[PDB]
């Protein structure tokens, strides 16, 4: 008399197949790429030109002496 089949309690689990967790698509990408890229170029011309100012300063001490 002690056999298995239970009265209730069932799901089931799915046979489904989906995980569309997107994801900033469709022209939202290529937008964070370009602006941060020119931001790095914007970081230039305030350092290389600044080091160029120090570069003439470095060559200044050479020319002032040597007579």
């Amino acid at each position: 008399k002690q056999d298995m089949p239970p009265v209730g309690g069932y799901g089931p689990i799915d046979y489904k197949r989906n995980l569309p967790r997107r994801g900033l698509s469709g022209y939202s990408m290529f937008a964070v790429g370009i602006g941060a890229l020119l931001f790095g170029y914007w970081s230039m011309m305030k350092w290389n030109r600044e080091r160029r100012r120090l570069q003439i300063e470095d060559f200044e001490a050479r020319i002032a002496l040597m007579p």
């Binding site: 994801g23 900033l24 698509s25 469709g26 022209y27 990408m29 290529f30 790429g33």
Partner: protein, 59 residues
């Protein structure tokens, strides 16, 4: 009965190619997917220390 899997024609319009162009060029694929499903490292290692621990059996 039937099911036709991997049977789907592409979109081929102006905007949806930008989802397939950002995929190849900037790799929004292969990192959001495959760099996150590996890590997934923080789970507990289910290893039996055999000379000390032992596994289950049946009568």
């Amino acid at each position: 009965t039937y099911k036709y899997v991997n049977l789907r024609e592409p979109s081929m319009d102006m905007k949806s190619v930008t989802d397939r162009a950002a995929q190849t060029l900037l790799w929004t694929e292969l990192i959001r997917g495959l760099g996150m499903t590996l890590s997934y490292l923080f789970r507990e290692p289910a290893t039996i220390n055999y000379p000390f621990e032992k596994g289950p059996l049946s009568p």
